[PDB]
Design a protein around this ligand. Structure first.
Ligand code: PLB
Lengths: 253, 254
């Protein structure tokens, strides 16, 4: 069957490219400065932040630590819609019961946000506003009582995750696997979900063998990173359990 | 290399048998009423508990289960030493691997002693119903339920002891443990255990698609039980100040 697996891999990669404007390949070029096109504007302290809001557009703009957290919310809501559009390209996804489609996205978007956030991170900071900015890890830590410990665990995961050296080709299938997980609560029909994931795990396995022939247990290592993601999502919602009515409706989650 | 991985699978299954007196194959023969094994006495209420026993009830049961974790930990420690490379790791790492790995292992193997209706006790001589455990006093009525919800799901994989042997080995040799000094040697070992396991699942479960994937995905549930379990011990400590914890169990819960 090792050809419709490579076809499912090529399909997914193509959607991923259409759905996510800033790809890892692209994000990598900006972060390593390997492409010396334009440097991102760097936010490394309070004065550069304030200058950054003058230069960079920012669609979400009172208080600084709050303002940064809300910007992250805006972007997260944006990510949710990119992921939802991608989920629809996954073969068989749209044929699932509508409630299950909603359930799979509801519990899955967070894990995928972190996965793709790792694509925009290094040990020193995170690319923001479509790669136009770069917010340092040290500037984020230097934030208030609850807010300075909000991005750190993402950076810690990213450093780990990024050491697998996956590319967009690999990430495209990996994200599809996350979405099609039949253990989400309240699913009504788990069978066709487990079926599609079985098919996606099979394509992810062959992809990793062909694309990373020298790292034998990369598949396993990647699967055990999925459990890492569930952990980070848990302690994050628990952090959102400390932190205008219409806006609080847009950001219900 | 295939032959090398098969040899490793054989080695670990062999040490598992020598280390764990109550195997899943034994537990299944007791639970499903075979003729290789005897039938357990069933504890389903305070009456059965009393006639079965051959300071309050919930505390007696909880402490009983606590003493069984101590035996498990001893068995687990004995089995780890047989995993090739484990005893050659830095001693501090050995302790860390055991400290964190042991609870995930206890709950994995405890699934072998469980069905949806209860769990085997006293080396399989007894069987305590899920409901008798679910009806215990306010904090102690909660302690077994996450393990049952896990067991029901974990058991649906239909793993046998030769699979579990390698999977337990993978659990112990995790380089994600807090405070590990040399992550690399641990990961090289795990890479090989993972290869062996992968081969084992393909060979032993040839009809069962992505069992390797599906089994590694079972770590999330293991982490959740552990987290919820240590939270419950914090509660027990504050409300039951006269109640004890075993030195070995003190060491681990940190
Ligand atoms: O953390 C994220 N984004 C931001 C967080 C804070 C922020 O806040 C901010 N920065 C500078 C000045 C004011 N506010 C802006 C963004 C962004 O992407 O633009 C983020 C969230 C999810 C995803 Cl998928 C990607 C990113 Cl880059």
């Amino acid at each position: 069957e090792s050809a419709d697996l490579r076809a499912l891999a090529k399909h997914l990669y193509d959607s991923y490219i259409k759905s996510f404007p800033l790809t890892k390949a692209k994000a990598r070029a900006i972060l390593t400065g390997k492409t010396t096109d334009k440097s991102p504007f760097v936010i490394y302290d309070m004065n550069s932040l304030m200058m950054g809001e003058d230069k960079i557009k920012f669609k979400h703009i009172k208080e600084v630590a709050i303002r940064i957290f809300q910007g992250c919310q805006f972007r997260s809501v944006e990510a949710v819609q990119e992921i939802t559009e991608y989920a629809k390209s996954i073969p068989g996804f749209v044929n699932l019961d509508l409630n299950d489609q909603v359930t799979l996205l509801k519990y899955g978007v967070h894990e995928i946000i972190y996965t793709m956030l790792a694509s925009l991170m290094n040990k020193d900071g995170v690319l923001i506003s479509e790669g136009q900015g770069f917010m340092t890890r040290e500037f984020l830590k230097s934030l208030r009582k609850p807010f300075g410990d909000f991005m750190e665990p993402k950076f810690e995961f990213a450093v780990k995750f990024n050491a697998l050296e996956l590319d967009d080709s690999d990430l495209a299938i990996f994200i599809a696997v996350i979405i099609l997980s039949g253990d989400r609560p309240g699913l009504l029909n788990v069978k066709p979900i487990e079926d599609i994931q079985d098919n996606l795990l099979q394509a992810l396995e062959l992809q990793l063998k062909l694309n990373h022939p020298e790292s034998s247990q990369l598949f396993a290592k990647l699967l055990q990173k999925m459990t890492d993601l569930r952990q980070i999502v848990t302690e994050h919602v628990q952090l959102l359990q400390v932190i205008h009515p219409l806006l609080q409706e847009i950001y219900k989650d």
